[PDB]
Structures are given as C-alpha cells and as structure tokens.
Scaffold this active site. Structure first.
Site, PDB file in Angstrom:
ATOM      1  N   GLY A 122     -80.775 -32.070 -26.356  1.00  0.00           N
ATOM      2  CA  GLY A 122     -80.793 -31.030 -27.316  1.00  0.00           C
ATOM      3  C   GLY A 122     -80.553 -29.861 -26.663  1.00  0.00           C
ATOM      4  CD  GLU A 123     -77.673 -28.944 -28.288  1.00  0.00           C
ATOM      5  OE1 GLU A 123     -77.979 -28.982 -29.305  1.00  0.00           O
ATOM      6  OE2 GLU A 123     -76.958 -29.879 -27.788  1.00  0.00           O
ATOM      7  CE  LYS A 150     -86.875 -28.526 -26.226  1.00  0.00           C
ATOM      8  NZ  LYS A 150     -87.283 -29.163 -25.191  1.00  0.00           N
ATOM      9  CB  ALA A 184     -76.674 -26.865 -23.551  1.00  0.00           C
ATOM     10  CG  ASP A 242     -90.043 -34.517 -18.295  1.00  0.00           C
ATOM     11  OD1 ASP A 242     -90.092 -34.562 -17.033  1.00  0.00           O
ATOM     12  OD2 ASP A 242     -89.272 -34.231 -19.066  1.00  0.00           O
TER      13      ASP A 242
HETATM   14  C1  LIG Z   1     -81.580 -19.852 -16.933  1.00  0.00           C
HETATM   15  C2  LIG Z   1     -81.704 -20.576 -18.485  1.00  0.00           C
HETATM   16  C3  LIG Z   1     -80.942 -19.763 -19.670  1.00  0.00           C
HETATM   17  C4  LIG Z   1     -81.111 -21.831 -18.329  1.00  0.00           C
HETATM   18  C5  LIG Z   1     -81.651 -22.929 -19.437  1.00  0.00           C
HETATM   19  N1  LIG Z   1     -83.073 -22.759 -19.357  1.00  0.00           N
HETATM   20  C6  LIG Z   1     -83.884 -23.265 -20.343  1.00  0.00           C
HETATM   21  C7  LIG Z   1     -85.423 -23.232 -20.159  1.00  0.00           C
HETATM   22  C8  LIG Z   1     -86.226 -23.369 -21.347  1.00  0.00           C
HETATM   23  C9  LIG Z   1     -86.019 -22.532 -22.335  1.00  0.00           C
HETATM   24  N2  LIG Z   1     -86.752 -22.667 -23.667  1.00  0.00           N
HETATM   25  C10 LIG Z   1     -87.274 -23.868 -23.961  1.00  0.00           C
HETATM   26  C11 LIG Z   1     -88.125 -23.793 -24.917  1.00  0.00           C
HETATM   27  C12 LIG Z   1     -88.813 -24.970 -25.689  1.00  0.00           C
HETATM   28  C13 LIG Z   1     -89.327 -25.898 -25.036  1.00  0.00           C
HETATM   29  C14 LIG Z   1     -89.857 -27.155 -25.796  1.00  0.00           C
HETATM   30  C15 LIG Z   1     -89.763 -26.956 -27.112  1.00  0.00           C
HETATM   31  O1  LIG Z   1     -90.408 -28.149 -28.016  1.00  0.00           O
HETATM   32  C16 LIG Z   1     -91.681 -28.708 -27.956  1.00  0.00           C
HETATM   33  C17 LIG Z   1     -91.773 -30.145 -28.214  1.00  0.00           C
HETATM   34  C18 LIG Z   1     -93.113 -30.628 -27.933  1.00  0.00           C
HETATM   35  C19 LIG Z   1     -94.055 -29.889 -27.420  1.00  0.00           C
HETATM   36  C20 LIG Z   1     -93.952 -28.503 -27.041  1.00  0.00           C
HETATM   37  C21 LIG Z   1     -92.685 -27.856 -27.317  1.00  0.00           C
HETATM   38  C22 LIG Z   1     -89.417 -25.932 -27.719  1.00  0.00           C
HETATM   39  C23 LIG Z   1     -88.599 -24.738 -27.226  1.00  0.00           C
HETATM   40  C24 LIG Z   1     -88.443 -22.132 -25.001  1.00  0.00           C
HETATM   41  C25 LIG Z   1     -89.053 -21.123 -25.564  1.00  0.00           C
HETATM   42  N3  LIG Z   1     -90.231 -21.802 -26.751  1.00  0.00           N
HETATM   43  N4  LIG Z   1     -89.041 -20.125 -25.463  1.00  0.00           N
HETATM   44  C26 LIG Z   1     -88.032 -19.746 -24.667  1.00  0.00           C
HETATM   45  N5  LIG Z   1     -87.242 -20.401 -23.807  1.00  0.00           N
HETATM   46  C27 LIG Z   1     -87.617 -21.736 -24.069  1.00  0.00           C
HETATM   47  C28 LIG Z   1     -84.521 -22.562 -22.802  1.00  0.00           C
HETATM   48  C29 LIG Z   1     -83.688 -22.523 -21.424  1.00  0.00           C
HETATM   49  C30 LIG Z   1     -81.123 -24.303 -18.939  1.00  0.00           C
HETATM   50  N6  LIG Z   1     -80.097 -24.593 -18.825  1.00  0.00           N
HETATM   51  O2  LIG Z   1     -82.100 -24.945 -18.566  1.00  0.00           O
END
Ligand SMILES: CC(C)C[C@H](N[C@H]1CC[C@H](n2cc(-c3ccc(Oc4ccccc4)cc3)c3c(N)ncnc32)CC1)C(N)=O
Length: 447
Positions: A195-196, A211, A191, A302
């Site tokens: 967004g989440e 996302k 989260a 970013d």
């Molecule tokens: C220890 C953790 C559980 C804590 C957690 N960590 C978070 C760290 C990132 C994690 N995350 C985020 C994306 C993502 C990123 C961008 C996206 O969209 C785009 C948009 C534009 C361009 C490319 C992609 C789509 C998916 C993602 C993914 N595809 N596969 C696995 N984990 C992912 C989610 C947990 C936190 N609280 O931080």
C-alpha cells in the site's frame, strides 16, 4: 451536579459544539468517550465538549504547573525538551506513593549536564504539604511560591512551569468506520509493497495520515475484526488509530507524524546528529510501547525501525502493530516480494511461523542495532542465507563503535535462539529507562 472549568482555546470543529474562552465554567452531564456534554455559563445553552480541554474546579488540574496523567519518565522528557530553563518544574501525581505528589525540577551540573531531580511532596494528616519537615504549606500553590523565591535546599530555585502544547482534539463521536469521501488525500508520503501512505485532510478540518492498502491485500471482515482490537491499544508510544474505511481499497486513518519513520529520521541531516543519550531515549520509548503491547498479550509481528514513527517533538510511536497478520497471502500480494524481512525475524518465526511476543523481542534487539548505527542494514556484508546459517552457529552481530556495552548486552539477550530465554519487554523497559541513572536514588533527600 459536577462542576468543571475550561482550560484552552477551542472553537467548534463540528456543528454541535460550544466555545472556549480559555476560561469558563461548565457542568458535565454524560461522560461517554472523550467528548462530554456539559452545562456551561455562557449562558444557558450547551452541547458537547472535549474532555481533555477541561478540568474539575476543585482539583489542581487547573494550575499551570500541574501535570495530570504523566509518568516520572515522561516528566523528565517534557522538562528536558527544548524551550525549558534551569529550575523549570512541574507537580505531578506520585508513582510510588498513591495520593501524594512529586516535584520534578530541571537541573544542570557540568558533571552530568542537563538532568531532572525529583522530590517527594508528602501530605500532612490534617491538611497541607511539605518536602522538608521544617517547611510545611497549606496548599501546593504555597509550596510553589515558596520555592520560587529561593531554592531552600532544592537543587534549583523554581523558575517557570514546564512548557506544554495544547493537546490533540479527541476524534469525532462515533466516527470509527468513515466514508471515503470524508478524506482528501493531499500528499503521497510513500509507496510500499502492499500500500501507500498519504497526508490527508478529514472533513476539511483535521490533518491525518492515511495508509491505503492495495486491492487484494486484505479482507474487509478479517481486517475489521483485527482493527477493532488495534484501536483499543491506546498508549503514548503507539500511533493512534482514528478510523477505517471498510471497503476495498481499505484505508487506515491515524495521527500524522511529522518526522516520518525512525529509519528515515536516523538517516536525515537532523536525526543523524542525535547524541547517544537521545538514541538510548528512543530505544526506551519503543521498549515502553512494546511492554504495553506485551502486557496486553498482543503481538507486533514486524517490529523494525521502518515501523517506528517520529513526532515533530521526537516522540517515538510504534506503528503497524499486528498489521502483518491481516495481510493476505494470495496471487496479488505474492508478486510484491518478501512478506517479512529475514534479517529482522526470529529463527522460530522463520522456520515454523511461530510469531510471539518473544519473536518481537528478537526483532527489538535488531532495532536496537539499527538505532545505534543510525539506520545501517542489519548484518552488513551478509546475504540472507548467510545470516540464517551464521545465527545457527552462535554468530551474532558484533558491537559497533559508539555502542555502550550494556546496550549491546541487552541486544545479545534479545538474540537467544531459544525464545523462553529472551527477556521480557517489562525488563527491557526498566533497564533502558534507568540506563544512565542506575546507581542513583529515585528522589533527593533534602535536609
Ligand atoms: C523518506 C520517506 C519519504 C520514504 C518513505 N518513508 C515512509 C515512512 C512511513 C511514513 N508514514 C507511515 C505512516 C503510517 C504507518 C502505519 C499506519 O497504519 C497503522 C496500521 C496498524 C497499526 C498502526 C498504524 C498509518 C500510517 C505515517 C504517519 N502516520 N505519519 C507520517 N508518516 C507516516 C510514510 C513514508 C518510504 N518510501 O519508505
């Protein structure tokens, strides 16, 4: 009449697709996208097939030891991956010699540890191949069988082909903007401010990440215009955008990355134990991703360890590229705190809103420091105003323990106050790719 042979085992995920018995014969029709329509040999009825699971029968793409598409740098990574052995090898297209080939062999010495040696496979004018003139071959298959029986001047005797996993099935035909109902959100991964992110299943058959943007955070039209540029940014070191839901709350659908963000990873039991040469390899992977973004005249906006994702096999992929641009500033997003992090952001971006590939280069230097400290906060002990004022007076983060001086030098170059003085990602790429192999030749000269 273009003839094509199958390679892997795949059943129809959709309702229009055929079968793959890890071996077949097909004849392609239309060649649009990554799905091709092909005339197959079981028997006289057809449909569409995944292009990456098949190959022409004439070329070496059928051979288990041939790796089409991949680079020198990626050949090394593939080979140095767990599950390969001494003399593990591959043949690939040459980088520095059009039309010719390269042999890459997994080596070991107590002085340099695990390495990969590369050999030029020269082509003869009237047919055939050789590495050394005294040993020529009609076919690459003969060359391989030869060096499998003895090293004959190579670093090792060839043992087995580089391991390889069955590639990702290409995304469904014309499924760019998809209905929300086609997704089942199964597990909330995290989260965030705007967004989440969820692990989810698409049409009951494919694992993805989604996302989910907070209502109020983005405009559908502005986002879609930007997303239509994002999807074209295809590269091994960028996370792949599959699809979007173009209705608030906007969903972004991408490949799922099993090890989460690089920041999470570096802070995990497993990632906190990666050795320095592996940390440098992550840096190189991100630099390659950014050089592509730079060559495509795009801006990340970013860049930081939190926005780098990590695959099951430790491939780093850049995420959220360009996303900050289409996050709106309004009453909704405002109650969520800082839009961008001061400690990662170039001074001209902070002071004037000048976001360029050069402010990305500044962020990359910060990311470098995050990596070598395994996810430590930038500027430990300092507040945001203190960082800004210190930076104005030439202060820069000092080199930490367990940081090679050349890596630090690269950071300092990234942290020039004047953006035009910062290096290119093309430069950064080259220095990081060749970090441990700088005073070494590209290929081995075998007598
Ligand atoms: C220890 C953790 C559980 C804590 C957690 N960590 C978070 C760290 C990132 C994690 N995350 C985020 C994306 C993502 C990123 C961008 C996206 O969209 C785009 C948009 C534009 C361009 C490319 C992609 C789509 C998916 C993602 C993914 N595809 N596969 C696995 N984990 C992912 C989610 C947990 C936190 N609280 O931080």
């Amino acid at each position: 009449r273009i003839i094509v042979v199958a390679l892997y085992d795949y059943e129809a995920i959709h309702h229009e697709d055929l079968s793959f018995q890890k071996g077949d014969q097909m004849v392609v029709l239309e060649e649009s996208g990554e799905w091709w329509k092909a005339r197959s040999l079981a028997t006289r009825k057809e449909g569409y097939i995944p292009s990456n699971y098949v190959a022409r029968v004439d070329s070496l793409e059928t051979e288990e030891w041939f790796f089409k598409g991949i680079s020198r740098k990626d050949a090394e990574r593939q080979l140095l991956a767990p599950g390969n052995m001494l003399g593990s090898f591959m043949i690939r297209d040459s980088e520095t010699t059009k039309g010719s080939y390269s042999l890459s062999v997994r080596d070991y010495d107590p002085r340099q540890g695990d390495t990969v040696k590369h050999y030029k496979i020269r082509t003869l004018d009237n047919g055939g191949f050789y590495i050394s003139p005294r040993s020529t071959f009609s076919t690459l298959q003969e060359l391989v069988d030869h060096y499998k029986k003895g090293n004959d001047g190579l670093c090792q005797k060839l043992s087995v082909p580089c391991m390889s996993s069955k590639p990702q099935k290409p995304w469904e035909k014309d499924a760019w903007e998809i209905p929300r109902e086609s997704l089942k959100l199964e597990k909330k991964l995290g989260a965030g401010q705007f967004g989440e992110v969820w692990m989810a299943t698409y049409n009951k058959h494919t694992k993805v990440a989604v996302k989910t943007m907070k209502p109020g955070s983005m405009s559908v039209e502005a986002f879609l215009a930007e997303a239509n540029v994002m999807k074209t940014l295809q590269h091994d070191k960028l996370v792949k955008l599959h699809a979007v839901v173009t209705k608030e709350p906007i969903y972004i659908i991408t490949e799922f990355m099993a090890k989460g963000s690089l920041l999470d990873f570096l802070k995990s039991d497993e990632g906190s134990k990666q050795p320095l040469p592996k940390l440098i390899d992550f840096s190189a992977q991100i630099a390659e991703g950014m050089a592509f973004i730079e060559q495509r005249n795009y801006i990340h906006r970013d860049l930081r360890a939190a926005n780098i994702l990590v695959s099951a096999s430790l491939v780093c992929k850049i995420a959220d590229f360009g996303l900050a641009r289409v996050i709106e500033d309004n009453e909704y997003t405002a109650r969520e705190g800082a839009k961008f992090p001061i400690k990662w952001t170039a001074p001209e971006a902070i002071n004037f809103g000048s976001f360029t590939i050069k402010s990305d280069v500044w962020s990359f230097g910060i990311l470098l420091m995050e990596i070598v400290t395994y996810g430590r906060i930038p500027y430990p002990g300092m507040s945001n105003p203190e960082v800004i004022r210190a930076l104005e007076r030439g202060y820069r983060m000092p080199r930490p323990e367990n940081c090679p001086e050349e890596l630090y030098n690269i950071m300092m170059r990234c942290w020039k106050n004047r953006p035009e003085e910062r290096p290119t990602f093309e430069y950064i790429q080259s220095v990081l790719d060749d970090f441990y192999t700088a005073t070494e030749s590209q290929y081995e000269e075998i007598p």
